[PDB]
């Protein structure tokens, strides 16, 4: 990998984003972070009320006005926000060349487990309702809203409404009990993710309700009739093997999946493309991937 991947890990190490005491330090680490890397000028941001839910349209210069990506952050569904995720955002829309809603789901522990899917769900049959296609259409997410970009479109198939030409997962997170051998495998390796703070968040977002309770953790949820799915993961990553199992599960329910792991890259590597190379080549092949789905 790049040398600027040793100046990411080395920024990680120290911040360590998700180890901080409180969920308000928390919150706001990951926001004094994202500003490290600000919005570039010709980025238009358009405050929405998507149907229920708070958004922002994110919007370039060279955004197809009828394309949609609803993207979904991360931050275990617990922290991140319409701040800390922009920046990914526009990189997204920049090279899938499409507009991108970026949604304030409820967070956890104030907004336990549904919360955060009844506002995803709610934004996209709002996104169809305000006259988006879904053949031009995709729904993506890092990490914890890697996992929430799965149960959105199972919850949306399963109330019948028709589901998106693509989605894709970053690193995504959908084992809420950290029992993947990479868990304990890559522990060394990974500077952001480790068992303990998944715990903590898994903990807040279920507040009792079963770990595999499928709209929280849909590595046990019904895959079946699932639009193509990229899923990009780095392999120095202890929720490696939720991409890997996520990709079997969906691969036996008989979706169309391309599973790309990137050597030595850490968790949602992709936020760090500003200084990190491999961070913009994964989000270019991202808008490929986007734009041969809409095709």
């Not at 919005?39 to 149907?51: K, M, N, S």
């Not at 500077?191 to 709209?215: C, F, H, I, K, N």
């Amino acid at each position: 990998a790049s040398e600027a991947l040793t100046m990411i890990v080395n920024l990680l190490r120290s911040q360590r984003p998700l180890q901080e005491p409180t969920v308000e330090q928390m919150r706001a680490g990951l926001e004094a972070m994202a500003q490290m890397s600000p919005l570039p000028a010709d980025v238009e941001l358009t405050t929405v009320d998507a149907g229920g839910v708070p958004g922002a349209w994110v919007r370039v210069p060279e955004s197809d006005p009828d394309r949609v990506v609803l993207y979904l952050h991360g931050g275990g569904y617990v922290i991140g926000s319409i701040r800390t995720h922009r920046d990914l955002a526009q990189r997204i829309a920049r090279a899938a060349r499409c507009r991108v809603l970026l949604i304030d789901y409820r967070l956890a522990p104030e907004h336990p487990h549904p919360a955060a899917v009844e506002d995803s769900t709610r934004a996209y049959r709002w996104l169809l309702e305000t006259g988006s296609d879904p053949k031009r259409m995709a729904i993506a997410g890092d990490a914890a809203g890697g996992g929430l970009t799965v149960a959105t479109l199972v919850a949306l198939r399963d109330a019948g409404v028709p589901l998106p030409a693509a989605a894709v997962c970053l690193s995504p997170w959908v084992d809420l009990e950290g029992i993947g051998e990479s868990m304990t495998t890559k522990a060394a390796v990974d500077p952001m993710v480790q068992r303990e703070p998944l715990l903590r968040m898994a903990s807040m977002y279920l507040a009792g309700q079963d770990p595999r309770t499928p709209l929280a953790a849909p590595l046990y949820a019904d895959l079946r009739g699932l639009p193509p799915l990229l899923i990009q993961v780095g392999t120095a990553e202890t929720l490696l093997d939720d991409s890997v199992r996520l990709a079997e599960r969906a691969r036996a329910a008989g979706v169309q999946v391309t599973l790309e792991p990137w050597e030595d890259m850490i968790h949602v590597w992709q936020a760090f493309a500003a200084m990190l190379p491999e961070g913009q080549q994964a989000i270019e092949r991202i808008g490929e991937f986007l734009r041969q789905h809409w095709q």
